[PDB]
Nucleic acid binder design. Sequence first.
DNA 1: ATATACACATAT
DNA 2: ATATATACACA
DNA 3: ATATGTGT
DNA 4: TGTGTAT
Lengths: 442, 442, 213, 213
Amino acid sequence: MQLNNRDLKSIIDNEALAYAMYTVENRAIPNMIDGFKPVQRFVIARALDLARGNKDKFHKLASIAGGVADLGYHHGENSAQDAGALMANTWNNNFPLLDGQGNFGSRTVQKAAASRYIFARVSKNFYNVYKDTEYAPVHQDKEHIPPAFYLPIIPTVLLNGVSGIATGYATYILPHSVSSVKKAVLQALQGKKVTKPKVEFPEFRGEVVEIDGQYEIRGTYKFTSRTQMHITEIPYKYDRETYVSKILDPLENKGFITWDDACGEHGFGFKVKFRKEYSLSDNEEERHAKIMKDFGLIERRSQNITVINEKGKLQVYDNVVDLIKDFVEVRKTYVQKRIDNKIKETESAFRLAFAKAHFIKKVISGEIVVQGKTRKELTEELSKIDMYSSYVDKLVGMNIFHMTSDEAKKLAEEAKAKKEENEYWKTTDVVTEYTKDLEEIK
Amino acid sequence: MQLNNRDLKSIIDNEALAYAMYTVENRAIPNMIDGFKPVQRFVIARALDLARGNKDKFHKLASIAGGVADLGYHHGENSAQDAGALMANTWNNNFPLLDGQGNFGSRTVQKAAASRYIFARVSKNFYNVYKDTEYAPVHQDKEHIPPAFYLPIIPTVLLNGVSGIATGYATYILPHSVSSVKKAVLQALQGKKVTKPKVEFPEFRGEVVEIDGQYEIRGTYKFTSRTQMHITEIPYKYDRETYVSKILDPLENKGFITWDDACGEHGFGFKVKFRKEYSLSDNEEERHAKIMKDFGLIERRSQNITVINEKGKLQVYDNVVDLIKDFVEVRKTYVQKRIDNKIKETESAFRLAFAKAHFIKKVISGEIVVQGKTRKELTEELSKIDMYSSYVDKLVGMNIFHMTSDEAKKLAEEAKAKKEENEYWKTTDVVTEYTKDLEEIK
Amino acid sequence: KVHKHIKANLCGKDADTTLFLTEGDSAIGYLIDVRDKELHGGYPLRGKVLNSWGMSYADMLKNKELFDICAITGLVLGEKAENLNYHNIAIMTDADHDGLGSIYPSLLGFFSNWPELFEQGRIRFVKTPVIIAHVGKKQEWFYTVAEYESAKDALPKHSIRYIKGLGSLEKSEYREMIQNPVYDVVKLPENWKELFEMLMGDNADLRKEWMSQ
Amino acid sequence: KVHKHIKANLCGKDADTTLFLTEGDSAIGYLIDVRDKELHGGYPLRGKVLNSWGMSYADMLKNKELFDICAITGLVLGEKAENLNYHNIAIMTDADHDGLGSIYPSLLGFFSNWPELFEQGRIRFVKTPVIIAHVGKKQEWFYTVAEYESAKDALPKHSIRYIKGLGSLEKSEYREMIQNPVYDVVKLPENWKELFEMLMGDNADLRKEWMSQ
DNA sequence: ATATACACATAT
DNA sequence: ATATATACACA
DNA sequence: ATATGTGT
DNA sequence: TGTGTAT
Ligand SMILES: COc1cc(NS(C)(=O)=O)ccc1Nc1c2ccccc2nc2ccccc12
Ligand SMILES: COc1cc(NS(C)(=O)=O)ccc1Nc1c2ccccc2nc2ccccc12
Ligand SMILES: [Mg+2]
Ligand SMILES: [Mg+2]
C-alpha cells in the first residue's frame, strides 16, 4: 500500500482531456476524406476482407463485426454491428456503401430486425467511387491495419448524410444527390465556379430549397376538389406512426379533417377530406401557406459541418462549397500519388514483360544452353545477363503451357501493348484521371 | 381460407415422432464412432475450416460458432458457442479436442467467463486420434456439409465423458483413461479378451473402485497426529463452496470438529481438528467408515452407455467392452475403405509421375519438339500416344524449373517412392494399419 | 395489461377475433403491419413451453407464458372456457422440428385443459410454406418437403427458397398468409388422455416403446 | 441489502476497510476470489456514470449506480459525511480512455459534493497496470503507456500483453494489485468548484475553448 | 455488459 | 430470443 | 431435490 | 426532443 499525491486540475488536464481528445477525433466525427467514422472504417475493412473471391456472397453482420477487434477495434463488438447495420441500410442510404439483405424496414416503418440477423456485403457503389484503397495513408498506430482513411472519388460524407455528437463539438450534414456532387467536383477540378449541390433525400418525391443556409423540405399535395385533397409526399423526418399520431389525429379530432391511408411501395400517400370547422380561404396564397403549415409539410434543417481533416484535427466549414474545394484540393495530391505509384508499377511490369519476351525468344532460338544445368547453374547463367539479372525467381518460373511458338509472338505483342498502359499513366494529369473516374459513376 | 381437418392423433405420429427421433438421433446423443453430438460436429468442422494453414490461431468462440450456419446448422447461433466452450475447458477435459484460452475457472471455483470472450482452436489431440476425415461418410442431406461422422482411432465417446439427454433416451459415460482405452482397443483388434478400461477423472489424485457397476470415487486423507488430520483430496463432484456449505459448516455446527483452509494453486487441501463431541473409536475400520460417511470422500456413479451406430440408429450397450469391439469392427471396415481409396489414389499418382518422368526424359533427349506447335496442336500431337493420353494438360503443365537436369533424377526418385508406397498399400492389411495408427497416440 | 400483446380493435366481443401465437418477436413485428385492423392479435412465445400435464393449476400458472395466455384469452384453468376475449387461437410456428414437434404439442396439451374448444374448431394451426418458389408471377407454396420432392419436375424450372423460420418470410408472403390463411383444425380422437400421458408423462418407459413401433 | 456488493468483516467499524468501485462485473467476480474478507469490499459500475454536477439533490438519487454508491458507503448528499461504512473509496476503473476520462472524472465530480473526504485521503484511484511484461525472469508492471517508451530500450528481453480491460487480468496480477495496492490520492485545488463547471457544466463554449488549447 | 426459463432422463 | 441507462451538442 | 448439455 | 458511437 503506497500513496501518491495527485491534483484534480492535473487530472482534468491530463486524463479527462485525453478522453475529450478521443471522442472527437477518434469516435464520432467523420473523416472528411472518406466520410467514415473509425468504427465504420473497421466494418468496411472487414467486409472487404470477407468478400474475397465471392464478392456477391452475403455474410452475416455477426461475422462482419466479430473480427474487427483483431483489426484494431478496442471498444467491443455490438457497436460495430450497429454501425454496420446502419451503414448497410437499403432505403435510408442515398448512396449505399454496403448492400444489405434483411428486414431493414422502409420509410413507412423504420425498425431493423436485430442488426445481427441481417446480411451485408460490399455494394457496387463502394467499388465504383472508392477507386483506390491501397495507396491510402497508413495509421500511426502499428495495430491499426485499416488505413488512416479511404480515398473515394466524390466526398461520400455528404452523399448519405452524417450526424455525430462529440465532446465540445458536433456534426450534422444533409444528404446530397450523386449527380450534383459529381458536377460540383468537376467544376472544382477544372477551375470554374462551384455551384451548391442540391439536397436529395432517397426515394423522395418532394423538393428542397436553400434559404440562407437553411434547407426547407416541402411536401406535395394536390387538391382533388374544393372539398378533398391527396397528399402525395411528406418530409423525410415524418414516420407513419409519428405523422398519424402527432399532426393528423390532433387536427382530425377537432372537427377539422377526415383522413385515410394510401400507403404502398412508393407509399406515404394520404387522402383527406375537409370538414366544416376547417375554414379554408379561397385566396390561394394564404390557403397554400396554411395548408403547408397545418399539416407540417414544411421542415427546416441546418447543416453543422465539422469534420476531421487530413491532418486529423477538427475543421469547421461554413459552406459545403469550401468543403468540396478542399476535398478536391487534397484528392488532387492523392491522385497524383496514385499516378506516381502506377508509374512505378507500369515500369516494373514493362521490365518483367520485356525480360519474359527476351527469355522466350532466346529459348526459341536455342542460344540458352539449358542442357546439363541445375537450378544453381541456371541461376548462375541467368543472373549474369543484365536483362535477366533483375528478374530470376519469376523470370524462369513459367509453366510450359505458358510458352509456345505462337504464344511467343502473343507475349511479344502483350509486351508491346504494355507501352500503351505505360503511357496512359505517364502523359496525363490529375484532371484527366479524376474526370474519367467521375464519368464512371453510373 | 382452407380449413383442413386433421386428428390430434397422427400428429403425434408425424411431427412429435419427428421431433423426438430428431432429439435422439441429431441433437443430444453422441455417435458411436466420433463421439460427437451433431452440434459439436458443426463446431469442430467450422474450427477446422478456420484453421486452414495457420492452425495455431486462437479464434474467438463468437467466430467459430458464427460461421456454422452455412454448414447445415439450423438451431440458432448462441448454442454452438456453449457447445464449443464445454469442449474447450482446460480442467474438465480428460482428452481435450479444443484447446482454449480465457477464464475457464478451475476445480476449486468452477465458473467460466461468458462464451463470447473465450478463444478456441483445434487441439493436438484432435489431429492425433481423428483420421481419415476425407474418407468419412456423406450425409444424405445436401446442406449437411460436415460428414455423417468422423473417424477417430480410439472411441472418443469414452475419453472425455459425456452426458446427453434426449426424448425417451439418455446417455451418461464416465471419463475413461487414454491408456486403458488404447490397451483395450489393441486387445480387441488382435482378437484377444478385452480388459475393462479404468476411469481416470482429470487431475485427480484420488482413486476409483468399481463394485457392482457402481464406480466409487474416493479421496485420500492423512492423519498427521491424534487430533489433526489433513484432507488431501476430495471427490470430483465437489467444489470448495459446495464442500464448505454442505459438509464442513454442518460439521462445525455439530461442533464435533473444527477445520482450516489450506487451499492453493494445487488441488483441494484442508486441515481439521476434532472436538470432544466427535467419536474417535481406535478401531481404524470404524474410523475409516466414519470419516468417509461424514467427510464426503465417496461418490457413487453409474454408466448409461447409449450411442448411435454407423446406421444412424440408437443402441444401448451394457459394457464398455462391447462398445469397444463394435467400434473396432466398424473402424476396421473404414480402414479397409481407406486402404482401397489409398491404393487407387497412389496408383493414379504413380501413373501421373511415370508420365511426367517419361516426358521429361523425352524432352531432355529432344524426342518431342516444343517449338512450332499450338495449344490444340501440341495437345493433339501428344495425346495421340496411348500412354500419354491419360493426362495431357497436367502433364504439359509444368515449368522450365521442372524440366531440369537433376530434376529428372528427382522425378525418378519420386516415381520410385510412388511405386514403393503402391506396393506398401497393396500388401498391408487392415490390422497392420490400425495398429500403426493406434501406437501413435501419446 | 400485458405487453407484446398486439390487441385487436374488436377484441372482447363475439366475432371471430383470432390470436396468432407466433413463435418469436420478429414474426409479430412483421405481422403488425400486414394484419387486419380487427380480428387479428398476436402474442409471442419466448422459448420453449412448460409442460402443462399433471401438476396443479396453482403451480402450473406460476409460469409466465401461461398466465400471459390465460390473461389475453378468456381461458381460465379450472373452469369452462366460453367467455374468451378472442374467438380463435391460430398457433403458428417455424418449419423446423422444434416448432411443430415441441412447441405445438406442448400448446395442445396445455389447451387440453379445456377440451370443449377442440370440437368447436377454435384452436387451429396456421400453415407455413416450407418451400417457396417464384416461377415468374407464379408463387409455388409447398407446406411440406414431400410435395416439393414429388413436384420437382412437374414444372419447367423454379427457384426454391428455404424458409428457416417465420423471420425469413417477406412482407408480401406474410400478408398473403395472414389474410388468406390455410388452417389445420385439430380435433381430439376418442382417446386423448392416453397419448398425452404417453408423451407428456413422467414414465419414459412408454416412450421407449413409442419410438420403436 | 444491495446486490452486486460484497461486504467485509469490519464494515461499519473502525478499520481501513475499502470499497473498490470497479467498472465491470468480471472485476468483482475476480475480486471475490482475492478479496480479503475483512478489509475489502466492492461494487461494479455497469454503464457510463451520470454527470451529477448541476442536478438537483432530488434528481440525483434516481440513477441506480448513484443511489447504490451513496447507500453502500452511507454518504448523504446534504448533510456532512462523518459516519461512513467504509474508511476508503477506491476507483478501480479501466486503463482505457472511457474509464480514465469519463467514469473517473464523473465519479470525482459526484464525490465532490462532500469535499471533506478529499483532504482526509479517503477517496483515491487504484492505478491499473497496462504494459505487464515478462521483463527478465518474471512479470514486470508498467502503469502508463508513456512509461513503456520511457523504459522500452532499457529492458533486455520481454514480452507484450496489452491489458485491454480489467477482465484480461488473471488471478495472479489481480492478487498482486489487490493485496499490494498502488493508490493515487485526489486532492482538490482552490478552484475545484470552478473546474467542474468547465467539464460537467452545460456550456459547450468553455469546453470548446479549453479543447482548443 | 448482464439477466431473463423451460424441454428432455436417470442415478443419487 | 429480447430487455435493461448513461454522455455528448446543436437545431 | 438435484446436476448435466443442447435447443427455444 | 431526435441523432450515433461507447460503457
Ligand atoms: C447503467 O448502465 C447499465 C445499467 C444496467 N442495469 S441497472 C440496475 O445498473 O440500472 C444494466 C446495464 C447497463 N449498461 C449497459 C451496457 C454496458 C456495457 C456495454 C453495453 C451496454 N449496453 C446497454 C444497453 C442498454 C442499457 C444498458 C446497457
Ligand atoms: C420462458 O422463456 C423466456 C422467458 C423470458 N421472460 S419474459 C418476462 O420476456 O416472458 C425471456 C426469455 C425467455 N427465453 C429464452 C430464450 C429464447 C430464445 C432463445 C434463447 C433464449 N435464451 C434464454 C436464456 C435465459 C432465459 C431465457 C431465455
Ligand atoms: Mg428454428
Ligand atoms: Mg474498455
